[PDB]
Amino acid sequence: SQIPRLSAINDLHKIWPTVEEHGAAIIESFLSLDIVRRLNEEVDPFVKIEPIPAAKTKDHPNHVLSTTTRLVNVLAPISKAYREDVLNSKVLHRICSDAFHVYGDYWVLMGAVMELAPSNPAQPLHRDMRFSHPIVEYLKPDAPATSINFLVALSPFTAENGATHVILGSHKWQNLSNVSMDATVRALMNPGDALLITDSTIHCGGAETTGTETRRLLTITMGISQLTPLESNLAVPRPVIESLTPLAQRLLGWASQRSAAPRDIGLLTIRGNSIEKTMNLKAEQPL
Ligand SMILES: CN1C(=O)c2ccccc2NC(=O)[C@H]1Cc1ccccc1
Ligand SMILES: O=C(O)CCC(=O)C(=O)O
Ligand SMILES: [Fe+3]
Helix, strand or coil: CCCCEEECCCCHHHHHHHHHHHCEEEEECCCCHHHHHHHHHHHHHHHHHCCCCCCCCCCCCCCCCCCCEEEEECCCCCCHHHHHHHCCCHHHHHHHHHHHCCCECEEEEEEEEEEECCCCCCCCCECCCCCCCHHHHHCCCCCCCCEEEEEEECCCECCCCCCCEECCCHHHCCCCCCCCHHHCEECCECCCCEEEEECCCCEECCCCCCCCCCEEEEEEEEEECCCCCCCCCCCCCHHHHCCCCHHHHHHCCCCCECECCCCCCCECCECCECHHHHHCCCCCCCC
């Protein structure tokens, strides 16, 4: 029983309901091949100079990822394609406003390119967020998902090169005795396709068995604005921020945020006024 594959345009309204039901879905052509090309070109060197996740020079080493994983986040200052095309993706936002309407505004918890070296082993089956947001474990099991993860293929995902594994329905599992690779299916994707899961979906990167291919993805963890992002844009240069749309600015923490509470008093406000209003933050200004 395989992962449901949906069209990004034809099937748009069906994507989140599918994920909310089965815990994963494949969005075909989530990003056009042109945007994939530009993303790749724009991140390439930063991937090449990224060290091992737990590198001794980092003051927040990542000990969980394998030393053959490279992860580069805070993509806005690196990539025009990301901060213009990806952050304003209309598919991304209809899915996110579908999934999060119960909670209110959403933003990027983390936008990151992961490239896995040849023969990178499968990851352990996991739920995301358990090394950053322990509060999530304390949610009632039927609480609506507070973050979701777009795993976007920047190169081909094949069974042989390590395409991600998911366990269908595992986002509703409380008893974990059922957990094992036996229960998984694969996300077979062309570049630009995206695998979409929730923070409860049990999944892992697969084993790279060709010993040659280098697999690369863009993982966009979108979450309610009530949860703190894994990454900071505080250091992104103001001229970059002001080149963006207001929507993009909000997604990066450069705007105030709102809950869905009918009388919402808002998040990250300043004496009752927004960040952008207070700071007179320009938008969509070219560089
Ligand atoms: C540790 N870890 C990340 O680094 C990560 C990377 C990209 C996007 C999300 C993300 N979030 C996480 O919670 C996890 C995923 C994980 C990976 C291997 C083993 C166990 C868990
Ligand atoms: O490598 C993959 O395909 C998935 C990686 C993943 O799920 C994670 O890093 O949390
Ligand atoms: Fe993961």
